[PDB]
Amino acid sequence: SIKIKNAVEIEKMRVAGRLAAEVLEMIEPHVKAGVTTEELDQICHKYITEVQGAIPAPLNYHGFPKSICTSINHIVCHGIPASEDTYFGQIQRPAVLRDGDILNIDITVIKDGYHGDTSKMFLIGDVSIEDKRLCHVAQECLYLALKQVKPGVQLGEIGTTIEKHIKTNNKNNPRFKFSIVRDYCGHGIGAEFHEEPQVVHYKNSDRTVLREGMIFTIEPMINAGKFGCRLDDEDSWTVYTADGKKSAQWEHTILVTATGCEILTLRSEESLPRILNNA
Ligand code: NA
Ligand code: NI
Ligand code: NI
């Protein structure tokens, strides 16, 4: 049940991936201290629907109350845009950006029935060395995983490569040790948001062989403390680190090519090739 996309579906996925990247490029000048995540949601929703002629997937199909996910600091994923800071018991549920914050914006767009999914970290004003390291190492995990993708590679090499990087980081940088979130994984993506296979980001022995024409996400979540997470049972969605330390994530949607992969959600800012030859 893993789908191999045909040429027409690959072109529809290329368009949807570029649109998802373009939302992130568009929103960047609006991301700064004193801005609400609700404001960012309004700007993205209007851009996606009126300029791109596309659909925000979370709002329309997944039961999410907003168009984008905005995850600040100790929020791991699925942060909900809002206008006011609130609390889940003793845990902060932030909505307004401050100097020193880190923010993940997660974009999922549909254009002519095909999905593009991507996310990136934004550094708000003067961020600490520990928080910059977290963001940077999380991106390195994604980039090193991409360098492993080509036909014939077993899926477990992705999480094994990510975990190798984090173990090396931890050995070499005892001041800045990280853990890998286990509860959330990457996934096949195409005409449906959730397709096979499941792509875990820690060390594993999944024997599923990558094939040209497969499209899936890689989206490692790295914690500054321990790996565990807590789900917000009041809003149903927000995921927090269980220990309250920060968490960072980057995501791309990628196509397996004959010799490597194509990064459908590549941004103009990234020094990563759109097409990797990993052969
Ligand atoms: Na976070
Ligand atoms: Ni996403
Ligand atoms: Ni995803």
From TrEMBL:
Binding annotation for a divalent metal cation 1: 106, 117, 251
Alphabetical list of NCBIfam families matching this protein: met_pdase_I (TIGR00500), PRK12318.1 (NF008970)
Function description: Removes the N-terminal methionine from nascent proteins. The N-terminal methionine is often cleaved when the second residue in the primary sequence is small and uncharged (Met-Ala-, Cys, Gly, Pro, Ser, Thr, or Val). Requires deformylation of the N(alpha)-formylated initiator methionine before it can be hydrolyzed.
HAMAP family from the UniProt entry: MetAP_1
Gene: map
Subunit field text: Monomer.
EC assignment: 3.4.11.18
Keyword Hydrolase recorded: yes
Cofactor binding: number and manner: Binds 2 divalent metal cations per subunit. Has a high-affinity and a low affinity metal-binding site. The true nature of the physiological cofactor is under debate. The enzyme is active with cobalt, zinc, manganese or divalent iron ions. Most likely, methionine aminopeptidases function as mononuclear Fe(2+)-metalloproteases under physiological conditions, and the catalytically relevant metal-binding site has been assigned to the histidine-containing high-affinity site.
Positions bound to substrate: 78, 194
Family, as annotated: Belongs to the peptidase M24A family. Methionine aminopeptidase type 1 subfamily.
Annotated positions binding a divalent metal cation 2: 117, 187, 219, 251
Keyword Transcription regulation among record annotations: no
One GO term of the biological process aspect: proteolysis
Reaction equation(s) it catalyzes: Release of N-terminal amino acids, preferentially methionine, from peptides and arylamides
Keywords: Aminopeptidase, Hydrolase, Metal-binding, Protease
GO CC terms, sorted: cytosol
Names of the cofactor(s): Mn(2+); Fe(2+); Co(2+); Zn(2+)
Single Gene Ontology MF annotation: metalloaminopeptidase activity
Taxonomic path: Bacteria, Pseudomonadati, Pseudomonadota, Gammaproteobacteria, Vibrionales
Protein name: Methionine aminopeptidase
Domain Peptidase M24: 11-258
